[PDB]
Amino acid sequence: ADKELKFLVVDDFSTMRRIVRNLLKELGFNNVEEAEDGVDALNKLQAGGYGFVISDWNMPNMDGLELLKTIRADGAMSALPVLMVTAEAKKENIIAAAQAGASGYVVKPFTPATLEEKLNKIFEKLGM
Numbered sequence: 001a002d003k004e005l006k007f008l009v010v011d012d013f014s015t016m017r018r019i020v021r022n023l024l025k026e027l028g029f030n031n032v033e034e035a036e037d038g039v040d041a042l043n044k045l046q047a048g049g050y051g052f053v054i055s056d057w058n059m060p061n062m063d064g065l066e067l068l069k070t071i072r073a074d075g076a077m078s079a080l081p082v083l084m085v086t087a088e089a090k091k092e093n094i095i096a097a098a099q100a101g102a103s104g105y106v107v108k109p110f111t112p113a114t115l116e117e118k119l120n121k122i123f124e125k126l127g128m
């Protein structure tokens with residue numbers, strides 16, 4: 001994928017965002033910004049420039065599932081890739097994410113290898 005691809009990393013906890021940001025850097029992606037909930041995320045997304053969202057599940061103000069649905073229903077942002085992160089693979093979460101059109105899911109805690117594989121799966125599928 002293009003190393004200038006701009007990522008938005010969304011989580012209400014700084015430590016989780018820092019993990020993802022560092023992993024993206026290791027993979028060669030330095031164009032990365034952070035958001036602390038779904039509303040903060042949409043505010044950044046609608047300001048423009050983003051090509052990929054990595055979002056947690058549970059957040060105040062607007063949670064990750066709601067963020068995903070809002071993105072998918074948006075007349076402009078509908079196609080934006082969104083990788084959802086879930087604390088544990090409760091089948092209901094995984095199912096809900098799939099139904100709502102998530103690009104992929106990853107269960108935390110996750111290894112660097114797992115995130116890399118998940119991202120590449122999405123890139124390759126989308127011809128990125």
Ligand SMILES: [Mn+2]
Pocket residue numbers: 011012013056057058059
């Ligand atoms: Mn959370």
Ligand SMILES: [N+]
Pocket residue numbers: 063064065066
């Ligand atoms: N939700």
